[PDB]
Design a protein around this ligand. Structure first.
Ligand SMILES: [Mg+2]
Length: 233
């Protein structure tokens, strides 16, 4: 697709999130860049309202899959870039096992030459001292696959996946993700065969930053589609 042309180099990224979890209101602003050639994201997020009322790892998935590296042989399956520059709406339900849920709505689009992710997050039915509001989740992140399928009726896609958040006692907090993406513009998009995004995420801190924040290095690579290239060798 035509949109893929927008991603051949380093693209600046801005992320802005407004959240309410159990009446705890907060905002996050992120800045960095993406280079889809390497499936690579480098971002720093700051909670601009004070202390973040949920653990940072629980927000990683909400906080630009247009930066995934789609191998050449699978580029006809890249919905995300094909919707650019007009963008897409991304909605999720994130169900924390034995606890509350996030509902998110985002618009991901270009503003000039910057890729912007604007998000509203609503969390309900969290337990006062469960793993989320009780801050019992380690500051780390496990690799996962995002399983994508076409939704041709909506001219878009759906995804399903499980995030496993490590609890500080050695256990796991499951976060089931259900996702839908639909284009903002009316131009044609790519509707993919089933495949997945292999995602690896590393969380860190800026040693000179006093605000509540998260430094993220993430690699995202599309996979899962059959090719006959081995025959070439
Ligand atoms: Mg109720």
């Amino acid at each position: 697709s035509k949109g893929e042309e927008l991603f051949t180099g380093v693209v600046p990224i801005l992320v802005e999130l407004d959240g309410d979890v159990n009446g705890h209101k907060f905002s996050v602003s992120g800045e960095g860049e993406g280079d889809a050639t390497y499936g690579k994201l480098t971002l720093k997020f700051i909670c601009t309202t004070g202390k973040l009322p949920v653990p940072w790892p629980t927000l990683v998935t909400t906080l630009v899959q247009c930066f995934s590296r789609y191998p050449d042989h699978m580029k006809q399956h890249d919905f995300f870039k094909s919707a650019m520059p007009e963008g897409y709406v991304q909605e999720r339900t994130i169900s924390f096992k034995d606890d509350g849920n996030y509902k998110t709505r985002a618009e991901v689009k270009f503003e000039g030459d910057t890729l912007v992710n604007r998000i509203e997050l609503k969390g309900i039915d969290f337990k006062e001292d469960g793993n989320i509001l009780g801050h019992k989740l380690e500051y780390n992140y496990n690799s996962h696959n995002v399983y994508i399928t076409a939704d041709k009726q909506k001219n878009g896609i759906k995804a399903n996946f499980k995030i496993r958040h490590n609890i500080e006692d050695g256990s796991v907090q499951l976060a089931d993700h259900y996702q839908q993406n639909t284009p903002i513009g009316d131009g044609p998009v790519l509707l993919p065969d089933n495949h997945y995004l292999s995602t690896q995420s590393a969380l860190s801190k800026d040693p000179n930053e006093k605000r509540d924040h998260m430094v993220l290095l993430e690699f995202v690579t599309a996979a899962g589609i059959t090719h006959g290239m081995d025959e070439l060798y």
